[PDB]
Amino acid sequence: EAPHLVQVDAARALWPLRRFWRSTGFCPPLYVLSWDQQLNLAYVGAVPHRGIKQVRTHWLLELVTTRGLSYNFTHLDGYLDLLRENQLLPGFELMGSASGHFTDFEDKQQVFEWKDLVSSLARRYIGRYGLAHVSKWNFETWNEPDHHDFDNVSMTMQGFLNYYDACSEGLRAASPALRLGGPGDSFHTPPRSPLSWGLLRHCHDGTNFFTGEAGVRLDYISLHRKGARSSISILEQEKVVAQQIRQLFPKFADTPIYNDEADPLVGWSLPQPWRADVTYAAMVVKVIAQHQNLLLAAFPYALLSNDNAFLSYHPHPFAQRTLTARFQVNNTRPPHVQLLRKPVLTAMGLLALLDEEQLWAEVSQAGTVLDSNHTVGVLASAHRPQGPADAWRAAVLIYASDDTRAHPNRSVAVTLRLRGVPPGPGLVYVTRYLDNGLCSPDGEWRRLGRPVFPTAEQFRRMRAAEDPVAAAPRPLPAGGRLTLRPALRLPSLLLVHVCARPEKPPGQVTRLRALPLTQGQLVLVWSDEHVGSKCLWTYEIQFSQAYTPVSRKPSTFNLFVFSPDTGAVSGSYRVRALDYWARPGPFSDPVPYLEVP
Ligand SMILES: *[C@@H]1O[C@H](CO)[C@@H](O[C@@H]2O[C@H](CO)[C@@H](O[C@@H]3O[C@H](CO)[C@@H](O)[C@H](O)[C@@H]3O)[C@H](O)[C@H]2NC(C)=O)[C@H](O)[C@H]1NC(C)=O
Ligand SMILES: *[C@@H]1O[C@H](CO)[C@@H](O)[C@H](O)[C@H]1NC(C)=O
Ligand SMILES: *[C@@H]1O[C@H](CO)[C@@H](O)[C@H](O)[C@H]1NC(C)=O
Ligand SMILES: *[C@H]1[C@H](N)[C@@H](C(=O)O)[C@@H](O)[C@H](O)[C@H]1O
Ligand SMILES: [Cl-]
């Protein structure tokens, strides 16, 4: 592209910037407690600053069995505990037959039983995690009721309404604070998608199966719309459906709309080279910027989820719609699993640095102003100080993305003119850059000859490309102004982080834990919930076999694979935050690790 001017005015905070994109999801195949999944959700929960919050999970109610009605919740307990351990919430689709029990939602007895199952499970988890926590969950209907083969379950139009009423009453009986929505489907033009449009009319005007009341609770409306490789198309399609909802159903004018399957392209398992690397990452940011700049900044849009928490399959470790790249290394004894962080997951960590107020910004090319429906765009945020562990911040995230198309020839000259940064102590800036040249684990894999079972050393070389290229903190010029002139590739992401120096140093890393990978290798993962500030250079890790630093390139991602040359991993580990002014936080409580022949 021709040169782009990107202006950001830090003195001009316009309105809130809600972090509406912090969701992923997946469908188990016909698993959720496997070691593979345990590693996967550790990667998902390791996005800093709760950058991913929800995991929308299909078939949760196939993790419950019945007797008689009694319910065995053992498997469901295991999955929800695993999300909880990783600071994640279920996108709780009320989806499953309870291992064959439910077959017909026009059978009155089954409808009552469904309500009891939903009451029972809700009360259980309110008891297990607390009401405050469970009230944050998006309980949702069965996935895509108009595009699903219900098979051994009979789910008619009326059945779906009966089912819904049982979901709603089941949750109500447990607590009125619990949230329910649906249908989680595309809303094709009537007379298509009868169960989806039918749900809305039923909730607007229909009769409640249990109470006879006119209308039924619907806390949010969830749709699914994908891009067919176009980013802007997602937004376009959402607006058409939201307008039809608004016109047909006056009561839903302020009802929140979710797009909880908002992917570039339908079909997660289809190999696509652009899914492997920064191409997918930059498009995801582009879609988000489009939503903030062209919609939210007036339909009541509240949530966007990229449905990309699936585990990839041989022979396509990198090329599927996944946050991680899975390698089932079958030539070791015993065989083991390794995951790599793909650029899309790393990108969610850059988005996570965006703060609560949107700053004025303008992108232009030779004086023509361009909105986010273009290949180059920006999201800029500012943060107002909380306490003494906090201070003023600005985060500027620039994308260069031609959707699913990557051209190795293609670059863009950007001039970033940041002004209006308020006076503050120890002002510094840090840049983080991602492109396919420097930061593609898939690139490194292909350069090594695409080994199906990479060696330990080969895995090290691939992982070295996971993190962005980071420039050390530099002091900001006086007058609160900064001009940068980066060359950006297409695709690429550039985050410019400007921080004032908090009075106190970082807080403590917590919930350190170690997941075994194989002999001589483990994953360390931790929480940043008490660290306080986002102005972090790295997490210093120490190992006592006393304590010595594990030297590594800077990384703010809350997970590290330890794979020393020696295979000596027995001992204890501890982790602490290091800020932009070289001040450490307190070390986490340490975690022991013992390999036993
Ligand atoms: C290493 O061992 C594992 C055994 O766990 C092998 O995993 C299996 O890999 C195949 C893919 O080559 C998977 O089959 C695929 O399933 C999907 C979804 O149903 C389907 O779309 C594909 O066409 C294909 O049938 C299979 O699910 C998977 N099984 C498990 C339990 O993970 C892996 O292939 C072995 N690696 C090598 C190189 O032999
Ligand atoms: C519940 O299911 C689990 C695992 O599937 C099993 O270990 C447990 O014994 C079951 N409890 C029953 C049948 O009461
Ligand atoms: C985005 O730009 C294209 C032309 O490049 C235009 O046809 C489309 O309508 C635009 N969409 C929006 C929502 O601005
Ligand atoms: C939505 C979608 N049809 C699927 C896909 O695109 O692969 C997947 O994202 C999800 O499991 C479906 O509900
Ligand atoms: Cl996709």
Structural domains in the chain, CATH included, are 1-17+356-503 (2.60.40.1500), 18-355 (3.20.20.80), 504-597 (2.60.40.10)
Nearest residue (CA) to ligand 1, atom 13: 313
- Separation in Å, CA 75 to CA 24, 89, 136: 21, 16, 22
Task: Give yes or no for a contact between 359 and 348, defined as CB atoms under 8 angstroms apart.
Answer: no
- Residue 235: in which H helix or E strand, if any? helix 231-248
238 catalytic per annotation: no
Strand partners, 352: none
Cα separation of 482 and 419, whole Å?
7
> What are the percentages of helix, strand and coil residues in the chain, rounded to 5?
25, 30, 45
Residues across the chain: 597
Q: Residues lining ligand 1, CB < 6 A?
A: 29, 269, 313-314, 328, 330, 452
Token reading at 417 = 């003119």
Task: Specify whether the CB–CB gap between 256 and 303 falls below 8 A.
Answer: yes
Closest CA to 225 of 255, 193, 268, 184: 184
Task: Find, among 223, 203, 228, the residue nearest to 213 by Cα.
Answer: 203
Residue 367 makes CB contacts below 8 A (sequence gap 6+) with none
| 4: phi then psi, degrees, rounded to nearest 5 | -120, 130
- Could you say which ligand is closest to the alpha carbon of residue 240? 3
Q: 470 has which bridge partners?
A: 432
Look at residue 429 and give its three-state secondary structure: strand
Pocket residue to mutate for ligand 4, from 95, 258, 261, 313, most atoms within 8 A of Cβ: 261
CA distance 37 to 45: 12
CA of residue 80 to ligand 5 center, whole Å: 26
DSSP, collapsed to helix, strand or coil, labels residue 229 as coil
Kindly list the protein residues whose Cβ atom lies closer than 6 A to any atom of ligand 3. Answer: 232, 235-236, 373
**DSSP conformation class of 107:** S
435 is written with which tokens?
């492109």
356 among known catalytic residues:
no
Q: What angle do CA 205, 209, 214 make, to 5 degrees?
A: 25
Among protein residues, the one with the nearest Cα to ligand 1's atom 11 is 314
Asked whether the beta carbons of 412 and 400 are under 8 A apart, the reply is: yes
Closest protein CA for atom 12 of ligand 2: 72
- Catalytic residue selected from 261, 444, 466, 540: 261
Q: Peptide bond preceding 250: is omega within 30 degrees of 0, i.e. cis?
A: no
Give the residue whose CA is nearest to atom 13 of ligand 4: 143
Structure tokens at 372: 């986010």
Give the dihedral of Cα atoms 410, 412, 413, 417; nearest 10 deg.
-160
Query: Distance from the CA of 276 to the center of ligand 2, in angstroms?
Result: 40
Q: Are 281 and 245 in contact (CB under 8 A)?
A: no
Ligand nearest to the CA of 229: 5
Residue 183, strand partner residues: 222
CA dihedral 147, 152, 153, 158 (to 10 degrees): 80
Query: What is the Cα–Cα distance from 346 to 47, expressed in whole angstroms?
Result: 8
Q: How far is CA 172 from CA 166, 175, 179, 192, 207, in A?
A: 10, 5, 9, 31, 16
Nearest atom in ligand 4 to the alpha carbon of residue 269 is 7
What are the helix and strand counts (H, E) for the chain? 11, 30
With contact defined as beta carbons under 8 Å apart, do 490 and 509 qualify? no
Distance 74 CA to ligand 2 centre (A): 7
| 425 close to 480: Cβ distance less than 8 angstroms | no
Contacts of 240 (CB under 8 A, 6+ apart): none
Alpha carbon distances (Å) from 367 to 265, 361, 362, 412, 519? 34, 14, 10, 16, 59
Q: What is the DSSP letter of 104?
A: B
- Separation of alpha carbons 103 and 379, rounded Å: 48
Annotated binding-site members for alpha-D-mannopyranose: 28, 30, 268, 446, 450
Taking the CA of residue 26 as reference, the ligand 4 atom at the shortest distance is 11
Q: Is there a contact between 524 and 559 (Cβ–Cβ < 8 Å)?
A: yes
SS3 at position 15: strand
Task: Give dist(CA 70, CA 120) in Å, integer.
Answer: 10
Instruction: Find the 284 Cα to ligand 5 centroid distance in Å.
Output: 9
Most ligand 2 atoms within 8 A of CB, residue of 74, 76, 77, 99 to mutate? 74
CB-based contacts of 39, cutoff 8 Å, min separation 6: 324, 337, 339, 515, 523
User: Distance between CA atoms of 282 and 228, rounded to whole angstroms?
Assistant: 16
Q: Which residue puts its alpha carbon closest to atom 15 of ligand 1?
A: 313
Strand 179-185 with 492-499, pairing: unpaired
**β-strand pairing of 521-527 with 559-562:** antiparallel
Q: Which amino acid is at 234?
A: I
> Mutation test of ligand 1: which of 270, 314, 330 has the most ligand atoms closer than 8 Å to its C-beta?
314
Do the beta carbons of residue 461 and residue 344 sit within 8 Å?
no
| CA 267 / ligand 4 centre spacing (Å) | 6
CA dist., res. 432 & res. 8, Å (int): 17
Identify which of 523, 522, 549, 553 has the alpha carbon closest to the alpha carbon of residue 538.
553
3-state SS, one letter per residue, for 301-358: EEEECECCECCCCCCCCCCCCECEEEEEECCCCCCEEEEEECHHHHHHHHHCCCCCEE
Token pair of 432 as six digits: 């983080």
Q: Which of 93, 144, 444, 540 is catalytic?
A: 144
The single residue listed with the structure tokens 């249908």 is 183
CA distance 371 to 373: 5
Residue 219 neighbours by CB under 8 Å, 6+ apart: 179, 180, 181, 255, 256
Write down the H helix ranges in 464-558.
Answer: none
143 in contact with ligand 4, CB cutoff 6 A: yes
CA distance 55 to 313: 20
Q: CB–CB of 171/123 below 8 Å? A: no
315 Cα: distance to centroid of ligand 1 (angstroms): 8
How many CB atoms lie under 10 A from the CB of residue 16?
11
Pairing of strands 23-26, 54-57: parallel
Distance between CA atoms of residues 244 and 90, nearest Å? 29
Q: Are 354 and 13 in contact (CB under 8 A)?
A: no
The distance from CA 13 to its chain's CA centroid, rounded to whole angstroms, is 26
Cis previous bond, 256, omega within 30: no
SS3 459: helix
Resolution in angstroms comes to 2.0
Q: The tokens 């017909």 sit on which residue?
A: 104
CA distance 514 to 260: 32
Decide: residue 267, CB within 10 A, 0-12 exposed, 13-18 middle, 19+ buried: exposed
User: What sign results for the dihedral spanned by CA atoms 7, 13, 14, 18?
Assistant: positive
Q: What is the CA radius of gyration of the chain?
A: 24
Do 147 and 225 touch, CB atoms closer than 8 A? no
Distances (CA, A) of 419 to 177, 480, 566: 45, 6, 50
Distance CA 166, CA 459 (A): 49
Check: CB of residue 383 under 8 Å from CB of residue 529.
no
Query: For 71, which DSSP code?
Result: E
According to the entry, how was the structure determined?
Answer: X-ray
Question: How many whole angstroms separate alpha carbon 346 and alpha carbon 350?
Answer: 7
Provide CB contacts within 8 A for 516, sequence distance 6+: 522, 523
